[PDB]
Amino acid sequence: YGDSYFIDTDLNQLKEVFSGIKNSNEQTPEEMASLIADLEYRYSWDCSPLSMFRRHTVYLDSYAVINDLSTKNEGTRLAIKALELRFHGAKVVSCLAEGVSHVIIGEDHSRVADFKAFRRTFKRKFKILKESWVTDSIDKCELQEENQYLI
Amino acid sequence: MERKISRIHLVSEPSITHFLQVSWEKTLESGFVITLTDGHSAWTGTVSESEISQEADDMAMEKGKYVGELRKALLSGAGPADVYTFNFSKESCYFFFEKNLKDVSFRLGSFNLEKVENPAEVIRELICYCLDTIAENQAKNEHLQKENERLLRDWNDVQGRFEKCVSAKEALETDLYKRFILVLNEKKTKIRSLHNKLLNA
Amino acid sequence: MERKISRIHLVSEPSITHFLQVSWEKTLESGFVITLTDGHSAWTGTVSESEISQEADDMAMEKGKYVGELRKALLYTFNFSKESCYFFFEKNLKDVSFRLGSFNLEKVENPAEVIRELICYCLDTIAENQAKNEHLQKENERLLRDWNDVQGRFEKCVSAKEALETDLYKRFILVLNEKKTKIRSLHNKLLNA
């Protein structure tokens, strides 16, 4: 493409080069988490403000009862965690699975008992985290840590 | 069969009120049972068909509007459209409320009402239903304003998140562009170094 | 007045319920315009700020307790005495036993007038609260639509940003892998040639 081997490319060159390349995302979301997330890892960009959940997989806590994906909570801003997760390479698994590692507790904290049922059935245990880990973290344009955002 | 609260304002009897607490059947255009009460004597009765419209022709007004106006007067809320002087006559047991157009005595509906002794419990139930509707409306207002505040707070939060994301996503994409720029610049520097080494190889 | 008719029971007729019309006089300490009806008689008592200040501490008990009793009862086990026209009832609760206020009610001869007041306030309150509920559904629907629209806006923003980031990263991977192939080819050429 317009990319050169002896002339350093700037933003204008990159935009023209990328525009020359056809736009097509033919890649499954796992592969963004594996290889494309490694671009922010091998070259140290995992600290980007708006896209830092690339390797962090959270729980889209939007259900009154956990392990059931039909009791979506209406009238609340609990879906922001998933979109913020979807704002990065976060594998948004709506149900408690091996992917779930950051339980972002929203307006209901009594649901922790249901989390205990699947906290042992999966290897990477999820932890009870407040809205600051997801809902306020990308609002602050960062990626909070579980220990400082517990409950 | 239910009783609907319609306190017709008696100009002739400001002291002895009259409520046309209609207990209607499953019909509106035909004869509908209209029940009345005053405070110490209720006036119930069954209205026949083809006779309530004879006075409608005496009224010399539109049909169809007749049925709707009967519903308005019988049910809660006297209709502004066709205001009738609520002359619920105790002297004849005939609650005639009439719009005497062109200054002439025109009757509206043939209501065969009878005076009774003890409407106390019926009026108790009437005003009790009124204030139970008031209480449930107040509770509805309470949870409605609770939902109003909750939805407003969630709307503000989502709006703030969306505004921040749309404002900073272009900056983040430009940062990714600069990251690619630096990576390709270092790759090209390595390529030039290897080319120079090959020139001396 | 805010003549809210609240149901109370009779002493001899518990099943037949009088409606204690809890009114307002812009103050709550002075009780309310206590109008009562049975369908056969009227009890329109105009109790004012004359049996409150002195009656609060007459029985060696605090005004705060007296006003609390007024708020908790005048606004349960209710009992009205028709013979004396005196609204007193047995408040058989914890450390409460007395004639609640010297409410010597007034009785007008015509129950129809107090029934007029009761029905008028009842229907006016129904209409006002129904209009309140109507515009509250309106506002609730407006805010629900606004919140859903902004949530969908954030959905679209997140999807578009993720797609742009993904395609930029994929194009960058293509370019960088080609550059690394060039680098290793140059390594081989330097090693051999």
Attribute tags:
part of a larger assembly, 3 chains, A: 151 residues, 3-stranded parallel β-sheet, 4 helices, elongated, B: 201 residues, mainly alpha, 3-stranded antiparallel β-sheet, 3 helices, rod-shaped, enzyme binding (chain B), DNA repair (chain B), ubl conjugation (chain B), cytoplasm (chain B)
Structure explained in plain terms:
The PDB classes it as dna binding protein. Keywords: nhej, DNA-PKcs, Ku70/80, XLF, xrcc4, DNA-LigaseIV, DNA binding protein. The entry is titled "Cryo-EM structure of NHEJ super-complex (monomer)". Chain A is DNA ligase 4. The structure is cut from a larger assembly and holds one copy of chain A (151 residues) and two copies of chain B. Chain A has 151 residues and is mainly α. Helix content of chain A is 25%, strand content 5%. Chain A has helices at 11-20, 29-42, 80-86, 112-118, and strands at 58-59, 102-104, 127-129. A three-stranded parallel sheet of chain A has the order 1-2-3, covered by helices on one side. In chain A, strand 2 (102-104), helix 4 and strand 3 form a beta-alpha-beta unit. Chain A starts with 10 loop residues before the first helix and ends in a 22-residue tail after the last strand. Chain B is rod-shaped and about 130 Å long. Chain B is built from three helices and seven strands; from the N terminus they run ββββααβββα. The termini of chain B are far apart. The longest helix of chain B has 80 residues, at 120-199. Classes of the chains: A mainly alpha (151), B mainly alpha (201). Chains in contact: A-B, A-C, B-C. At the B-C interface, helix 3 of B face strand 1 and helix 3 of C.
Could you write a compact summary of the structure shown?
The structure is cut from a larger assembly and holds one copy of chain A (151 residues) and two copies of chain B. Chain A is mainly α and 151 residues long.
